[PDB]
Amino acid sequence: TELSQGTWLNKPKSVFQEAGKVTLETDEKTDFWRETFYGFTRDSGHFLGVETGSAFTAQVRVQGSYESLYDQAGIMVRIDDGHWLKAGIEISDGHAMLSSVLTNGKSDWSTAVYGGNARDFWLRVTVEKGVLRIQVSSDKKTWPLVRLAPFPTSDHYLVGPMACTPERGGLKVTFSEWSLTAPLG
């Protein structure tokens, strides 16, 4: 199922398509977070979701121009506003961080300094039998694990590009090299 068959949640004011690619500029005050610690909920982030069956593997290339605190881009898997995962690069603390947030009612955020090129990376996500696995790659050859966690079973998921700027907008990101299939095995 091709990238252009996705549906937007919070379509950005500025976005254009090329064959197999989506290029967007984020709007201000866009974020995804539920409750934990900060005591607010946000469901305003940009998400282009492609609908899946009950299990899938998805992969995408992410080329963002990060420049400010909290700038984020990557991939999201979503069931609804209370059950989702986002993963990718985020600017937090001192550096470009590889970050993931698994939300099941409430958000669970993990982060670490990213050792690759923040401006060009791939993500691969697999959901099957109530387990989500996230892998990242700097070369499309080797795919280290980022996260392995329970995730609710569902007849369908939405999966696809995500990007957020919780403060000032203007983050430019291109998504390409999309693939969505059943998991191996």
Side-chain angles (χ1 to χ4, degrees), residues 61-66 73 88-91 96-98 113-123 136-139:
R61 188 180 185 178
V62 185
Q63 295 176 108
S65 305
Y66 316 90
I89 288 294
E90 178 189 27
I91 309 312
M97 303 281 279
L98 188 61
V113 180
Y114 183 55
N117 179 6
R119 292 167 68 89
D120 191 1
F121 65 93
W122 289 260
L123 292 163
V136 65
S137 181
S138 65
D139 59 10

Side-chain angles (χ1 to χ4, degrees), residues 44-160:
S44 55
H46 308 298
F47 170 55
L48 177 58
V50 183
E51 189 177 346
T52 76
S54 61
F56 70 88
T57 294
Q59 181 173 305
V60 71
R61 188 180 185 178
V62 185
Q63 295 176 108
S65 305
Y66 316 90
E67 293 164 5
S68 307
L69 181 65
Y70 300 126
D71 283 11
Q72 311 162 34
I75 203 169
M76 161 171 279
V77 177
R78 180 174 174 104
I79 296 172
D80 53 37
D81 65 3
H83 306 83
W84 50 258
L85 173 128
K86 65 180 180 172
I89 288 294
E90 178 189 27
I91 309 312
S92 69
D93 233 324
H95 324 254
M97 303 281 279
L98 188 61
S99 174
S100 62
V101 179
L102 194 164
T103 297
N104 194 333
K106 295 180 186 173
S107 299
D108 175 349
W109 178 28
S110 188
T111 192
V113 180
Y114 183 55
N117 179 6
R119 292 167 68 89
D120 191 1
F121 65 93
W122 289 260
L123 292 163
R124 176 184 290 173
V125 179
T126 300
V127 174
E128 183 178 24
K129 296 175 299 181
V131 176
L132 186 151
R133 287 180 262 122
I134 306 174
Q135 297 167 83
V136 65
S137 181
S138 65
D139 59 10
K140 219 184 177 182
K141 304 298 176 182
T142 312
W143 299 87
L145 178 78
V146 172
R147 194 154 182 178
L148 176 71
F151 197 67
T153 57
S154 188
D155 288 343
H156 301 286
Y157 300 92
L158 296 163
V159 61

Side-chain angles (χ1 to χ4, degrees), residues 2-6 8 11 14-24 48 60-61 63 161 173-178:
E2 307 290 13
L3 193 55
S4 59
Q5 295 175 267
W8 287 101
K11 186 177 182 181
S14 180
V15 55
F16 68 92
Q17 175 189 22
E18 295 179 343
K21 310 183 185 171
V22 165
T23 298
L24 65 81
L48 177 58
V60 71
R61 188 180 185 178
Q63 295 176 108
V173 193
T174 295
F175 300 90
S176 65
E177 304 191 13
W178 177 252

Side-chain angles (χ1 to χ4, degrees), residues 12-41:
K13 291 181 170 61
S14 180
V15 55
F16 68 92
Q17 175 189 22
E18 295 179 343
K21 310 183 185 171
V22 165
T23 298
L24 65 81
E25 174 176 328
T26 64
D27 299 325
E28 71 176 6
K29 293 193 262 65
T30 50
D31 200 8
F32 284 117
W33 188 259
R34 269 189 80 82
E35 183 56 24
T36 310
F37 187 70
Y38 300 99
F40 55 65
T41 296

